[PDB]
Symmetry: C2
Subunit: 115 residues, 2 copies
C-alpha cells in the first residue's frame, strides 16, 4: 500500500525551453517506473511543463500539466496564493492522495533525514 | 465539503446495527460536522458502524473490507479497511494516502 507521496523541487515553465530549475515543488511516489510525478505546487500561475532528467542520465523528460487550481494558505508571513497543478490525465484517486498529503506534512521515515 | 487533513475517531461497528455496541474500530472523517469516509479495524465481518450524532445516532453501511499489513510500535499487524457506501474516488484517495504514509522503516 505504500504509494506514499514524496516531494522534491523541480524545473517547470510555460514552455519546454522556459523551464529553468527549482521553480516548483513536485509530488510523486514510486509506482514501479522509478519516479511518478502526480502534481506540482508553485507560486507561478502559467506553468505547463514539469522537467526532470532521465534516470540513466541520457536525456530529459517533460511532463504536461493541466491548468492549475488557485488556492490560499496561511503562513507566518500571512495569507499566500498558491497554484496546484495535476499532471494531464491524473485520476481522482491520485488527486485525492495529493490533497491529503498537502493537508499535513508527515515524515515517511524515522531516521534523522529529509522527510 | 472541502479539503482538510483527515482526522480519526473511535467508533462501534458490527455485522448489524444491533451488533454495533462497543468501540472496536477507527473511523477516518472530514470536518470541513463530521463526514465519515472509512473504517480501519481488526475484524473483517463489519457491515455497519454507528455515530452518535452531533439528538440521535447515525448508522452508515460499509463496503467489503480490504486486507492490509501495518507496522506498529509492537511488530507488524494485519487489518481491514472499510469504505463508506458510495464514497467517491477523490475521498478514497485521501484515505489511501493517509494509510500509506503510516509505516515505520528500520
Amino acid at each position: 500500500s505504500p504509494v506514499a507521496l514524496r516531494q522534491m523541487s523541480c524545473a517547470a515553465g510555460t514552455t519546454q525551453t522556459a523551464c529553468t530549475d527549482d521553480n516548483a515543488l513536485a509530488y510523486y511516489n514510486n509506482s514501479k517506473g522509478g519516479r511518478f510525478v502526480l502534481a506540482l505546487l508553485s507560486d507561478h500561475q502559467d506553468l505547463k511543463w514539469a522537467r526532470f532528467p532521465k534516470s540513466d542520465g541520457t536525456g530529459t523528460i517533460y511532463t504536461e500539466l493541466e491548468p492549475p487550481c488557485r488556492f490560499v494558505t496561511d503562513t507566518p508571513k500571512g495569507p499566500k496564493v498558491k497554484y496546484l497543478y495535476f499532471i494531464k490525465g491524473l485520476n481522482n484517486l491520485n488527486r485525492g492522495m495529493v490533497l491529503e498529503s498537502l493537508a499535513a506534512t508527515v515524515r515517511l521515515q524515522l531516521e534523522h533525514h529529509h522527510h
